[PDB]
Every structure is written in C-alpha cells, then in structure tokens.
C-alpha cells in the first residue's frame, strides 16, 4: 500500500505542469542534472507571464466588447506595454496587425 | 496509428479561467500562446544552461533559473516573476 498520488503542480500551487517542465528540462540537453526546485520555479514564472499577458489581452478584448481573445488583442496588449514589448520586440505575431499610429506632420492643418 | 501530440492549451485555458472567468480564447490565439510559452521556456532554459556552464556546475537549480529570469525579463516583470517563483518553491518545499 502507498499514498495516493499528489501532483507536483498541486504541491506547488500551480496550474502549469511541473512534471512536464521537469521532463523537458531533462530531455532538452540543458545540463547533466536538474534540481527539484528548477521545474517548480520555472513553471511559476511561465504561469506568471501567461497570466499577465492573458489578463491584459482580456482587458483589450473587453474594451472591444468581444468575449474571446484573438491575436489582435494579444498584439494590442503586448505592444501597448513597455516591458512586454521590449521582451517580445524581435517577435512577429501572426494575424496580430499593427498599432494605429499616424505621424503628426502627416495630419491636415 | 497516429501518435499523441503535446501542448500547453489546457494549462493556458486554466490560467485564463482564473484571470477572466467569462473570457474565452480562439484556437489561433491558443497557438500563439503555446508559441510564447515554448519560446520563453527555451530562453530561460538556455540561459540557465549557459550559467551552469560558466560556473562549471553540473546541476540546473532554482538559483540558476532565478538568475536567468533576472537576465531575460525586463523591469518589473523580473521582480514579479521572481516573487511568484520564490513563493511557489517555498510552498513546494513546505509541502
């Protein structure tokens, strides 16, 4: 007899899969050994980033009065933020479009 | 017989349900979020591997991952990600 299994995600209080992250760290040829806390810490960081972007995109979607997030909303959320934009400067988002921006000198009057 | 694929869609949806219970997400937006998660995973893992190699450590630890987070994530993203990860690691150790 042995105790009922308790996922490492639940033990850390995370939604992201700590076991999957640990497997990917081991199989990715990143190091010979992997500490037990590394997949937990990394899963927490990935969860934070995912939550931040998804909540900003949900705010953007609500401002457009639509219920589901689309690449346009993800693009808007990422580009309207200094830190997310500088983190993802070199990245192209498919079907994301561009921010509305017209130079002042091009306007009439 | 076709093999089983693998994606972060379930976890991204669970996080979306926590941050915006009523909000949904498109399939292509889910694909972009999977790309984001994979890219950031690869960046932190590569930087932590380089840190271990520079310091001649055989192990990738939470300290290496934290240093990689501080190097990669700019500004307050670094501080909040460090806080979230430290909280998760402390809770995991306590449990």
């Amino acid at each position: 007899a042995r105790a009922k299994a308790k996922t490492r995600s639940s033990r850390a209080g995370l939604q992201f899969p700590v076991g999957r992250v640990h497997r990917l760290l081991r199989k990715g040829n990143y190091s010979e050994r992997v500490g037990a806390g590394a997949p937990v810490y990394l899963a927490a960081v990935l969860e934070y980033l995912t939550a931040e972007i998804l909540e900003l995109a949900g705010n953007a979607a609500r401002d457009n009065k639509k219920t589901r997030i689309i690449p346009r909303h993800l693009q808007l959320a990422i580009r309207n933020d200094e830190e997310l934009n500088k983190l993802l400067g070199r990245v192209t988002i498919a079907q994301g479009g561009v921010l509305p921006n017209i130079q002042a000198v091009l306007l009439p009057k | 017989k076709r093999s089983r694929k693998e994606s972060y869609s379930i976890y991204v949806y669970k996080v979306l349900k926590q941050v915006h219970p009523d909000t949904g997400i498109s399939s292509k937006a889910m694909g972009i979020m999977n790309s984001f998660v994979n890219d950031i995973f690869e960046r932190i893992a590569g930087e932590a591997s380089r840190l271990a190699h520079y310091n001649k450590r055989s192990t990738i630890t939470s300290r290496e991952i934290q240093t990689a987070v501080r190097l990669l994530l700019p500004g307050e993203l670094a501080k909040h990600a460090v806080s979230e990860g430290t909280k998760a690691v402390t809770k995991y150790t306590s449990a």
Partner: single-chain antibody
Amino acid sequence: MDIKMTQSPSSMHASLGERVTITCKASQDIRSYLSWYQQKPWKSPKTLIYYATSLADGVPSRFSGSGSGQDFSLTINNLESDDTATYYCLQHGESPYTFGSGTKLEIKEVQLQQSGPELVEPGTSVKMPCKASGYTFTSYTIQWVKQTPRQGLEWIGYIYPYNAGTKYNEKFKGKATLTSDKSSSTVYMELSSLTSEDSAVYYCARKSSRLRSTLDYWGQGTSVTVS
C-alpha cells in the same frame, strides 16, 4: 457602480508593542488587487502592502496583509510612536480606483518633484508639474490623486508616457487633463474652471504598468486654494 471601499474601524487608540488589525471590505470582488498606505499628517502617503499580501520595499515585517476577494486586513504587530498615522486601503482591480475612508491610529532613488502651493481665483485654469527622476520615465505610469479633508483621497487618472495613453475618472472628465513631456521627464496636470470645491492637495504617484504593481512613490503634493 464604483467599487465602494469600507474600512470598518474608523479609529483606534492603542499602546506600544500591542497588535492592531484594520479591515477593508469591497462591494465587488477585486481579485487581491488591494494596497495599504500610511499617511502621516502633512506628509505624502507611503506604500505598505501591495497585492494584498506583499511587503513593499523597505517596509519592516511588522506590517502584514491578508485576505482576498472582498475581505482584506492589515495587521501591525509591534507598535511604536511612529505608527501614529492614517491608513487607507486602495483597490485597483477595476478601472475607477477607490481609496478607503481612512483609519486614524493614535499611540499613547526614485523622486517626483511637485510644484509648491498655488493660489488661484475661480473659473480660470492651473497647470501642475510632476518632475520625475531616478528611473526609466517611459516605463511607469504617473497617477494623480486628489486629497480633500472631507472626502479623503480620490483617484483622478493617469498618463502613460510610453504611448501618451490616458485614463480618467468619470467625476473628473473635462475638469482634469494630463500631458507628458519625455524630454524633461515631466507630467503636467491642467485643472479647468477652478471652483471653491476644487481646493485640495494634489499628488502625483508613480505606478508601473504591471497589473499587480501599486502606486509606490508619491510626490510631496501641491495644495491648490480657490478664493
């Protein structure tokens, strides 16, 4: 519809060393986006707790925050003479930010230069600068808060220097206007059609664009007096 903040204990008298607990209710769930502020008289408020549990930089472990959803609490463990100040809970989970009614307690480098006091006559306009220094100007929003002795603290709005984006409280639309100047790292607030009701102290406060980040550094305040 604006989220009502309810600090149940309006005032406490307490001796040194003993514990005090302050509570703050919410009319709607705010998902842990609540902050606590300590304001000594004739001084700008300072941040104590953010994200309902996290100690701000330089805050000793004496202060403790707890709760989520609608029930929140601030706990002080080892009182000193310096703890005599007013404590406000602030929610930022919804677009119109709302402070608490304020709780008085009696015990028995980022810089934001703000302009000095300004005497003004009704119906004209005034322009208040907020000169920020010591950090990446474009990376953080500048928040403006109005403090009257009779309504306490009121959030007016913010400007984001990165994209010149602005958001205003409905009560202050038209009354208030925000502008930024990257070259001098300065943010300007214009008040239009001054009225005797407008007599208040106005603060500019830095707040990051991160959703869990709170108003962390405050200007010394600019008192506007209407004849």
